Amino acid sequence: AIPRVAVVVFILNGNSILLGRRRSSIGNSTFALPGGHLEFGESFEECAAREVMEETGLKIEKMKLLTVTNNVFKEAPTPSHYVSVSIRAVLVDPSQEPKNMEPEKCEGWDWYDWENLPKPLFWPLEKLFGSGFNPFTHG
Amino acid sequence: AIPRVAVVVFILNGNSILLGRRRSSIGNSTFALPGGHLEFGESFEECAAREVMEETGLKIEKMKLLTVTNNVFKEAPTPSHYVSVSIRAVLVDPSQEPKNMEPEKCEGWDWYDWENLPKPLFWPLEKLFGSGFNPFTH
Ligand SMILES: [Mg+2]
Ligand SMILES: [Mg+2]
Ligand SMILES: [Mg+2]
Ligand SMILES: [Mg+2]
Ligand SMILES: [Mg+2]
Ligand SMILES: [Mg+2]
Ligand SMILES: [N+]
């Protein structure tokens, strides 16, 4: 069991970010960002765009590094440890509608306003926001 | 292969940081930070303190997250991909001096002034500095 790298993406659209409820052994039914495992040789930005495309169909651009978090799930059915690298991005076409391209892993994607975020948030996301982190203004 | 997580540590002492020349198949003889592989279940801060202790004997405190870099070495004898999390720290005892605890991996550790850094820096470190990154003010 070793720590595994994931990239997670804050897609900023107006005052909103894209979230979707997980269908997963970890954080089931909680609202989370699009994202996934970093592949060998891939950059953070390449991973962000690929994962967003694979999961939502959305085309993003202007990717920027935000932060990194350490997320240990010792009590999961398969104990897991993720190191999650967060990336900010925007839509190439702000009118583009999300699709649920991996519908066995997510209930669906929707936009949520920064001042009216849904609950329950996936714990790594809630914990990060609890530190005061704001993807619109960070860095 | 798969990307592997390392934690690397900027130990700030006055205007200086700790660096040591690698003995390695990647970046041999270049100046690098103390650090190493994150273990399962470990926090970034726990890893930083453990790796610094194992490599230098130094006791550090006040750890703080700085940034993360993606470092691919496709050309290495064994192709490697590291995701490096940088941590800032200071010495518990400012008078403590490092020891070369793992001479198989490093020639030794010394303090280098921010305005007079040595060369060659290990490429991930040189590339990070090339972006304007400064561990004292970040
Ligand atoms: Mg994945
Ligand atoms: Mg994947
Ligand atoms: Mg995917
Ligand atoms: Mg190591
Ligand atoms: Mg090690
Ligand atoms: Mg060691
Ligand atoms: N995660």
Strand content of chain A: 35-45%
Shape of chain A: globular
Q: For the largest interface in this structure, which chains are involved and how many residues does each contribute?
A: A-B, 22 and 21 residues
* Major pleated sheet of chain A: 7 strands, mixed
| CATH fold description of chain A | Nucleoside Triphosphate Pyrophosphohydrolase
State the helical fraction of chain A: 10-25%
Number of strands of chain A: 7
CATH class of chain A: Alpha Beta
In DSSP terms (H or I, runs of 4 or more residues), the helix count of chain A works out at: 2
PDB class: hydrolase
Keywords: nudx1, Arabidopsis thaliana, apo, hydrolase
Assembly: dimeric
Entry title: Crystal structure of AtNUDX1
Overview of this structure, please?
The structure is a homodimer. The first copy, chain A, is an alpha+beta fold and 139 residues long. Chain A has one domain: Nucleoside Triphosphate Pyrophosphohydrolase, CATH 3.90.79.10. Chain A has helices at 44-56, 123-130; strands spanning 4-13, 16-22, 31-32, 35-37, 60-73, 80-91, 106-113. In chain A, strands 1, 2, 3, 4, 5, 6 and 7 form a seven-stranded mixed sheet that branches. In chain A, strand 2 and strand 3 (31-32) form a beta hairpin. The radius of gyration of chain A is 14 Å and the shape is globular.
